[PDB]
Amino acid sequence: MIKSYAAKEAGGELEVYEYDPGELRPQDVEVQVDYCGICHSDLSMIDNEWGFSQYPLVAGHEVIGRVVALGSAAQDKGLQVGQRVGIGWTARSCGHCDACISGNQINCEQGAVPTIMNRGGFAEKLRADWQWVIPLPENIDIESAGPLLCGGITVFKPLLMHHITATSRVGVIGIGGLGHIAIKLLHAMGCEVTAFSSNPAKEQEVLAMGADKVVNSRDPQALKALAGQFDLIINTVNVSLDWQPYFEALTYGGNFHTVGAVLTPLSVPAFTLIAGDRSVSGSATGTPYELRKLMRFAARSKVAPTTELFPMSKINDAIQHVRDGKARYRVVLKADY
Amino acid sequence: SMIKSYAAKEAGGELEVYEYDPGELRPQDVEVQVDYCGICHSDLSMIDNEWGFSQYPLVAGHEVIGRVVALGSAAQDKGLQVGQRVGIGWTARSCGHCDACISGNQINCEQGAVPTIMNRGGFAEKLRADWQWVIPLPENIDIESAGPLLCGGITVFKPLLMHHITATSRVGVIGIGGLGHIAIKLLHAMGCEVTAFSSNPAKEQEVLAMGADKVVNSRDPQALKALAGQFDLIINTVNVSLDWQPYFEALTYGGNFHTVGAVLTPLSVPAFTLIAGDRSVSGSATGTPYELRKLMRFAARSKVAPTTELFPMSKINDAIQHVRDGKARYRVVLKA
Ligand SMILES: NC(=O)c1ccc[n+]([C@@H]2O[C@H](COP(=O)([O-])OP(=O)(O)OC[C@H]3O[C@@H](n4cnc5c(N)ncnc54)[C@H](OP(=O)(O)O)[C@@H]3O)[C@@H](O)[C@H]2O)c1
Ligand SMILES: NC(=O)c1ccc[n+]([C@@H]2O[C@H](COP(=O)([O-])OP(=O)(O)OC[C@H]3O[C@@H](n4cnc5c(N)ncnc54)[C@H](OP(=O)(O)O)[C@@H]3O)[C@@H](O)[C@H]2O)c1
Ligand SMILES: [Zn+2]
Ligand SMILES: [Zn+2]
Ligand SMILES: [Zn+2]
Ligand SMILES: [Zn+2]
């Protein structure tokens, strides 16, 4: 049995909960949790904000841990017992559809299985397919690496999709967990970087992360002044803002890319897309290769999430901390046991 | 419980019946019963040890259409079923877990992708390959001609992907043999402008009918001089060393010369030719499992089928000589 922290109903506090994982599947890897970040998606799933949560629910999906068991078909896949590894939002894919066999496992045509649906990292152990267990660079900071596995890849993927380079002008809306990692990554890439934030208390630290300037995200006149100045704007905000001034802040050929899980549909004038050949995009975390590459880049560039550590035994205080908007900038749980 | 095959016992030798024990089925392996197997010039090169890494006895053949007869213990939840019609190409094995493999670039496996031939190929009644290299086929594909698409087809398809060829591209093909005639057919289906460079005037009318806009003598440098700057891409399939400079000069600015032919004498590439016009010279090795899957679907939907001459597998030594003598029109296929 595995000891975890589970929600028994939508929006509930987490209780100690033990479950039987069954036998190790042939492709499975069992990982002993050392750290696990807390992601806004974890809150969304606990609260069933998206409509597919099943209870008891063991969330957590930003895991740094060590390999403790390898399935029968997972023995010569480059992993060894004791290896420090990461697990992100996704745990399973089929491996043989066109998407998987082309290196696009996140888009598995059978549906890639989220780690949380499989029982997640708010626990002492968890399991994933070996393809989704991410090897780590030797010198990576272990305490802060966890959020890179979801927050990091999620903002890294648009940089890949839209071919961002050092000459790009990139904005980031919402400097929380995902957003602040975005700022650090763009800085390491030499880009022009603008942070859009609703909290003046964050301004000085966000400038120190590498933002060239911080703009009030809730001021339409501030955005009006930036018309046509961005190649890419990444939205990480989960609430519905006035998006039109951000569309107009795009230069010709520019992209507005949302990774924030905005429930109210975006209102996208066809005339805004036509005049300037603009685009609106989304993406879901990333692929195993993109994760491997991100972790290596972050370690070599010394891009590390700004982290607040909590003991895993105080997970309910940690979760309320995030709900209350106090995460500076990502909360990470250290496993007790 | 052996596998009957046609093996070469020495470099350049004729093929003799040869039985071998494949061993236990590896967990990832798929055993395929051969229905057809193309003959590729790479088969001859391996038989003759032209490339210096052949091991004898050598069972060649790597353009296989067949049926799945057995699935290893880790190969049964991988979208394949016993009885399924499948293809196997030049490559049989890769590790699956290095960065190249897990990113969909299995042909570039960092442990070294294992050629089908090196672990016994398709000149046999059966062969085995990792499931990732077993290519599922579209329903309505012509199975008698499909075999060569698994190597000849993907090999000339890959530069079309690497160099982002579209219908407005101007593409030349040097050497209209097995690989080259498939490239002409593929380029025709894509709407490109297409020029064939050929050394054999007896092919000219057939190659025009395949879709070449014109056929130019591949051995006449003065004929290539008139086409200076007229091509975005030139694919070389020729295994011998030609006078390459006029082909480089036939590239427009930003154009690419791309060799899939296994030319032993190194290309002489003037830096000034690359600098003036921002040109490139490239190569590639067959392609990835996904690219193979996509190619088979495209070829079936577009009715791109290799022009094939069938031989019974028992007449394999006759078929090999037919290819050696330059008589293939345009790919020999062995029937099992
Ligand atoms: N697409 C994917 O694959 C993927 C992956 C992971 C997460 N997500 C989703 O991405 C979103 C952000 O995740 P996260 O972990 O970074 O959450 P987070 O730490 O709470 O960051 C959210 C940020 O958005 C801003 N924000 C929150 N409420 C706001 C409001 N009313 N008005 C203006 N700004 C507000 C705030 O930044 P400021 O203080 O700077 O204003 C806040 O820090 C979530 O919806 C998450 O579920 C998507
Ligand atoms: N890179 C890869 O991954 C890969 C994969 C498969 C094969 N290959 C290699 O590609 C090459 C072609 O294979 P293939 O099966 O298409 O061979 P093929 O059927 O023999 O075609 C070769 C063509 O090149 C021309 N040719 C031959 N000798 C010539 C000469 N002295 N001068 C001028 N042209 C000559 C001929 O075309 P014309 O009659 O029109 O002049 C001949 O038909 C081989 O070297 C093969 O090993 C590479
Ligand atoms: Zn997350
Ligand atoms: Zn899949
Ligand atoms: Zn071949
Ligand atoms: Zn590999």
Residue numbers in the entry:
A (entry chain B): 3 to 339
B (entry chain A): 2 to 337
Copy the relevant paper text.
Escherichia coli possess strong alcohol dehydrogenases that could contribute to producing alcohols through a designed pathway. YqhD belongs to the family III metal-dependent polyol dehydrogenases, while YjgB and YahK are classified as members of the cinnamyl alcohol dehydrogenase family. We observed a cleft between the SBD (substrate-binding domain) and NBD (nucleotide-binding domain) that forms the active site with a catalytic Zn2+ ion.
The electron density of NADP is clearly shown in the NADP(H) binding site of the EcYjgB-NADP complex structure. We observed that His42, Ser43, Ser46, Gly179, Leu180, Ser199, Ser200, Asn201, Glu208, Ser285, Gly327, and Arg332 constitute the NADP(H) binding site. In addition, conserved Ser199 and Lys204 make it possible to specifically select the 2′ phosphate of NADP(H) as a stabilizing 2′ phosphate of the dinucleotide while using a hydrogen bond and charge-charge interaction. As it is holding the NADP, the SBD moves about 4.0 Å toward the NBD with a root-mean-square deviation (r.m.s.d.) of 1.02 Å when compared to the apo structure. It represents that NADP binding can generate the closed form, as observed in other CAD/SAD family. During the determination of the structure comprising NADP, we found that a polyethylene glycol (PEG) fragment occupied its catalytic cavity, which was quite similar to a hexanaldehyde. Trp52 and Trp91 were shown to hold the ligand through CH-π stacking, which appeared to be a primary contributor for substrate recognition.
